[PDB]
Amino acid sequence: PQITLWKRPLVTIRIGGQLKEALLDTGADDTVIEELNLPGCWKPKLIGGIXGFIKVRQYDQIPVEIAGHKAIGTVLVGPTPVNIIGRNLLTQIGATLNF
Ligand SMILES: CCCC[C@@H](CN[C@@H](CCCC)C(=O)N[C@@H](CCC(N)=O)C(=O)N[C@@H](CCCNC(N)=[NH2+])C(N)=O)NC(=O)[C@@H](NC(=O)[C@@H](NC(C)=O)[C@@H](C)O)[C@@H](C)CC
């Protein structure tokens, strides 16, 4: 599909068997999702942006479907204000910027 940028590029994702809404963010290196449990598998990380840093739980090799496209990769979990799909998964679904 093609997504224009007149409004925030929000899409439905599936993760850990749960459906969420997330923002496709080309300015994010990584993917950041709120709450939800998961694997006895995670390790600590700090990630930053405007306003500084938050502590997150890094989970590896997590299956994540995005607009019907299967991806599998690192997912960071913490108190992000907005669920974010970053380049680590956008590359797996063949996403490009075009102008
Ligand atoms: C400045 C750092 C690079 C750009 C920034 C864009 N992320 C979005 C995330 C959405 C908000 C949680 C953002 O900050 N958007 C702001 C940009 C400022 C702006 N005014 O446009 C925004 O839209 N802010 C809205 C409010 C939130 C809107 N978004 C939304 N509701 N979805 C605004 N009006 O204030 N990327 C990031 O914040 C990511 N940071 C990174 O990718 C890198 N970190 C650093 C420090 O560069 C990497 C080394 O970790 C985060 C997610 C970690 C992977």
Whole-angstrom CA distances from 70 to 3, 29, 35, 54, 58 are: 18, 19, 21, 28, 20
**Dihedral sign for Cα atoms in the order 80, 85, 87, 92:** positive
**Alpha-helical runs (H) found in the chain:** 87-90
Whole-angstrom CA distances from 91 to 16, 17, 94, 96 are: 20, 22, 5, 8
Place of tokens 């102008």: 99
3-state secondary structure of 32: strand
Counting DSSP H helices and E strands in the chain, the numbers are 1, 7
Nearest-CA residue for atom 16 of ligand 1: 50
Ligand 1 centre and the CA of 37: distance in Å?
24
Q: Method used for this model?
A: X-ray
| List of residues 6+ apart from 19 with CB closer than 8 A | 12, 13
Query: What does DSSP assign to residue 50?
Result: T
Q: Which one, of 16, 6, 11, lies nearest residue 83 by Cα?
A: 11
| List of residues 6+ apart from 39 with CB closer than 8 A | 59, 62
3-state secondary structure of 4: coil
HSE-CB of 40 using CA atoms within 13 angstroms? 0
HSE-CB of 18 using CA atoms within 13 angstroms? 11
What is the resolution in angstroms? Answer: 1.7
Q: Is the CB of 29 under 6 A from ligand 1?
A: yes
Q: Where are the domains of the chain?
A: 1-99
Overall fold of domain 1-99: Cathepsin D, subunit A; domain 1 (2.40.70)
Contact in structure between 35 and 20 (CB atoms under 8 Å): no
Assigned token pair, 5: 């940028």
Ligand 1 centre and the CA of 11: distance in Å?
17
Nearest-CA residue for atom 18 of ligand 1: 50
